[PDB]
Amino acid sequence: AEPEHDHRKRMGLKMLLMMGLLVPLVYYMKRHKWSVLKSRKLAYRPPK
Amino acid sequence: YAQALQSVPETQVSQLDNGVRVASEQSSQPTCTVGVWIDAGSRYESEKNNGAGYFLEHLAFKGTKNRPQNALEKEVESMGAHLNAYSSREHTAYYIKALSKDVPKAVELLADIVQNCSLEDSQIEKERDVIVRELQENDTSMREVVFNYLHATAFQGTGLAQSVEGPSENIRKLSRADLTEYLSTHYTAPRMVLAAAGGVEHQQLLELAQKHFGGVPFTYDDDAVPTLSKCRFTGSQIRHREDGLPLAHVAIAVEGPGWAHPDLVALQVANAIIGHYDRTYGGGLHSSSPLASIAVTNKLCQSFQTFSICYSETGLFGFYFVCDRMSIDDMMFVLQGQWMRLCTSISESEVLRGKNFLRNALVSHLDGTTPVCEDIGRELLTYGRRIPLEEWEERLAEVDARMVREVCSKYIYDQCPAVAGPGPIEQLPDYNRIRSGMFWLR
Ligand SMILES: CCCCCCCCO[C@@H]1O[C@H](CO)[C@@H](O)[C@H](O)[C@H]1O
């Protein structure tokens, strides 16, 4: 019914490892660019 | 020319058994200017000490114990001599300009100030409110607040970050004492220099100084000069926004090498390439300085200036433009593009001029007596001795293209800059953007 089976799974393995590796990288990358905001600091200084 | 340089008299130098270095350049000019240049600035202050040196400046002239206000003023005015001075973050100075017929008198006056300021508890309290006011005037000069803010963030958390005038709180409360405390701590011979230029002859100077500067060192501290705590640079920004102003100010910069370092020449040559603009120029045809040309073609700004402000062991190599609310972006875009171009694909045809333009400055850097004195004063204080035009020449007369690149790129490429901007700056893109404007998609 599905001759792929074995092929489809060895493939599933390889995909899972990429997701594992790829998301954390882009996560660190996303976190990196943003930091400039997350860390940012406002202040209001009317001359009164 | 080369001969003109070669025939430029040497600058006599000699230290006292005291520690003071006395240097000068004898010319002929019936006039001249002499003054002392201190190894003291705001950099040397504390969180509570900061402002002293400035509070101090505003009293330096108002009289000494040996001769009160009414007199000091009267005695100088009366001899047609001019007494003026200043103080930065690492460098203060007081100078007088008279007829070289008064080296001895001037010299005495000088000393009497850097050694015995009245510090009249009654005068102080007055200047206190004079500064607090003068300070609120320095304020609306958005051209200066911007630089201050630059330093602030550039060297955030360090001695440099503090402004040369200081917080209003400090000024509102510094004590007759603190001032004295600041004076007797930094105004010492080892850190001071007595320089001059005019018809004055070295010897008459030395003696005169050696006579009124009767300082005496006991311990080893007195005789030694303390090195300051290094200042950490920080790629960061600070945005003082207010669409209420007519136009915006921007200043971006990377950390500089510091006096001692040679490259400050190649680097000084690069800035000569991007130069500066100012709506009163006549030049949509300006030689290079495309930044200026572009600034004219596309109306990018009211003006801009390239600068290599440096200190003992650090500095700031950047640029600053004044622009309308709407052309902030392109301007920054175009400029930041020039730095890259500068250190990624410069040309000989460029550096050649660059040099020349510098040499012409390099020389007019010494137009008059007051200014010359300024060099001797500084040079010694920051370099160690004096650099003759004849020298500066070579130093910057052997900078080729590849040299500019190698350096500029060494100090600019992919570095985290420090920007500052007051005024209507909504259009100025985020840090990340100006950041990735630090690497060329070579
Ligand atoms: C977004 C993450 C994508 C992960 C990559 C998909 C990997 C597919 O890889 C596949 O693995 C099979 C098993 O060895 C091979 O037979 C196929 O030729 C190969 O293309």
Please spell the DSSP secondary structure of B132-154, one letter per residue: HHHHHHHHT-HHHHHHHHHHHHH
- H helical segments located in A1-48: 5-38
3-class secondary structure, B31? coil
Full DSSP string of B200-256: --HHHHHHHHHHH------SHHHHS-PPPPP------EEEEE-TTSSSEEEEEEEEE
State whether residue B137 sits within 8 Å of chain A by CB: no
Chain A residues whose C-beta sits inside 8 Å of any chain B C-beta:
33, 36, 45
- Give the separation between CA B10 and CA B2, rounded to whole angstroms: 15
Q: Tell which residue, B38, B200, B179, has the closest CA to residue B105.
A: B200
The Å distance, Cα B312 to ligand 1 centre, comes to 59
CB burial class (10 A; 0-12, 13-18, 19+) of residue A42? exposed
Degrees (nearest 5) of the Cα angle B339, B342, B344?
Answer: 105
Q: Tell which residue, B298, B294, B320, has the closest CA to residue B423.
A: B320
Looking at residue B378, the DSSP 8-state letter turns out to be H
Degrees (nearest 5) of the Cα angle B345, B350, B353?
Answer: 160
- Give the separation between CA B58 and CA B51, rounded to whole angstroms: 11
CB-defined site of ligand 1, < 6 Å: A 7, 10-11, 14-15, 18
3-class secondary structure, B194? strand
The answer to whether the Cβ–Cβ distance between B430 and A33 falls below 8 Å is no
Topology match between the domains B11-224 and B236-439: yes
Q: Is the dihedral of CA B63, B69, B75, B77 positive or negative?
A: positive
- Give the separation between CA B366 and CA B409, rounded to whole angstroms: 31
- Give the separation between CA B151 and CA B158, rounded to whole angstroms: 10
Question: Which mutation among A5, A11, A15 tests ligand 1's pocket best, with the greatest number of atoms within 8 A of CB?
Answer: A11
All residues of chain A having their beta carbon less than 8 Å from the beta carbon of residue B431 are 36
Q: Which amino acid would we find at residue B76? A: V
Q: Report residue B148: phi and psi, to 5°.
A: -55, -60
Domain residues of chain B, as ranges?
11-224, 236-439
On whether the B236-439 domain is CATH 3.30.830.10, my answer is yes
CB burial class (10 A; 0-12, 13-18, 19+) of residue B417? buried
3-class secondary structure, B46? coil
The Å distance, Cα B433 to ligand 1 centre, comes to 36
Count CA atoms closer than 13 A to B12's CA, side-chain side.
16
- Give the separation between CA B364 and CA B2, rounded to whole angstroms: 16
Domains and CATH numbers, chain A: 4-48 (1.20.5.100)
Q: Give me the count of residues in chain A.
A: 48
Q: Give me the count of residues in chain B.
A: 442
Contact predicate B241/B424, CB 8 Å: yes
Any catalytic annotation for residue B313?
no
All residues of chain A having their beta carbon less than 8 Å from the beta carbon of residue B432 are 33, 36
Contact predicate B258/B383, CB 8 Å: no
- Give the separation between CA B416 and CA B233, rounded to whole angstroms: 10
Give the list of residues 6+ apart from residue B39 with CB closer than 8 angstroms, or none: B90, B91, B186, B190, B191, B192, B225, B381
CB burial class (10 A; 0-12, 13-18, 19+) of residue B79? middle
Experimental technique behind these coordinates: X-ray
CB burial class (10 A; 0-12, 13-18, 19+) of residue B163? buried
The Å distance, Cα A1 to ligand 1 centre, comes to 22
Q: Tell which residue, B168, B127, B162, has the closest CA to residue B45.
A: B162
Q: Report residue B65: phi and psi, to 5°.
A: -70, -40
Looking up tokens 């190698």 gives B406
Contact predicate B276/B414, CB 8 Å: no
- Give the separation between CA B18 and CA B111, rounded to whole angstroms: 14
Largest distance between two CA atoms of chain A: 79
Catalytic residue among B10, B45, B47, B57: B57
Angle between helices B401-411 and B328-344 (to 10 degrees): 120
Element (H or E) spanning B37, and its range? Answer: strand B32-38
- Give the separation between CA B50 and CA B45, rounded to whole angstroms: 5
- Give the separation between CA B168 and CA B198, rounded to whole angstroms: 41
Class (C level, CATH) for B11-224: alpha beta
Contact predicate B253/B150, CB 8 Å: yes
Structural tokens at position B111: 């000393």
Q: Report residue B391: phi and psi, to 5°.
A: -80, -65
Q: Report residue B169: phi and psi, to 5°.
A: -55, -55
For residue B194, the cross-strand partners are: B22, B36
